[PDB]
């Protein structure tokens, strides 16, 4: 694509500059270009990829919710047309990320840390597609998210300690998937509670810095449990 002529290292450097400038669409385009170089990504580069697209899709999700709410209240074609425009752009971003993951980030990821990271992303972006999906395509999209999250969970439980931040963030997101996408609030609560309690029991093994990383995500699990129970 349009980043084919730029050095991988230059694309990474510009992604970091774009982050500092809060230019997340640019950041995502630079990271897409870095991924398309074909080399595997480091932990820092995976985080740049994820942060960029999370910010882009986050703005789209927030806009879509505003428009959907106005549309529901209003039920001319303009509200529906514009909600559809935003929805299509959101779906396009999800498809782009899912495309990077299947071609070929996931299949080239052999280490637990990288494979879990990417499968969690696959779950997340199918989850964002599910949020806007309506009907049977909705069922298939939900199952795709579930499958990705479940495979990530299986690997993380076998290969990572219970305080691992990637493992914790995965469980957090899968529990939110259960609560409001799969309409399984009890599964959500059970997952969040077990994850929190097993991490709690492992905190004594950690350095001050790792302790801070793990407790930050545990607090998000607690935040959700407080709202759900």
């Amino acid at each position: 694509g349009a980043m084919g002529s730029m050095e991988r290292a230059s694309l990474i450097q510009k992604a970091k500059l774009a982050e500092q400038a809060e230019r997340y669409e640019d950041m995502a385009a630079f990271m897409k270009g870095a991924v398309e170089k074909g080399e595997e990504l480091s932990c820092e580069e995976r985080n740049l990829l994820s942060v960029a697209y999370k910010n882009v899709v986050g703005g789209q999700r927030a806009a879509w919710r505003v428009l959907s709410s106005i549309e529901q209240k209003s039920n001319g074609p303009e509200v529906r047309e514009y909600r559809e425009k935003v929805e299509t752009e959101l779906q396009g971003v999800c498809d782009t990320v899912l495309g990077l993951l299947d071609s070929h980030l996931i299949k080239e990821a052999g280490d637990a840390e990288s494979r879990v990271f990417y499968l969690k992303m696959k779950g997340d972006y199918y989850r964002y597609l599910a949020e806007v999906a309506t009907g049977d395509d909705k069922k298939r999209i939900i199952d795709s998210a579930r499958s990705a999250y479940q495979e990530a969970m299986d690997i993380s439980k076998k290969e990572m300690p219970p305080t691992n931040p990637i493992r914790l963030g995965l469980a957090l997101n899968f529990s939110v998937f259960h609560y409001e996408i799969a309409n399984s609030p009890e599964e959500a609560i059970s997952l969040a509670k077990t994850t929190f309690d097993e991490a709690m029991a492992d905190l004594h093994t950690l350095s001050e810095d790792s302790y801070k990383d793990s407790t930050l995500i545990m607090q998000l699990l607690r935040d959700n449990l407080t709202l759900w129970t």
Binding site: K54, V57, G58, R65, V176
Partner: peptide, 12 residues
């Protein structure tokens, strides 16, 4: 809509 906590930047 009430959004629950998920991982990473709270960008929505």
């Amino acid at each position: 809509k009430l959004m629950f906590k998920t991982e990473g930047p709270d960008s929505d």
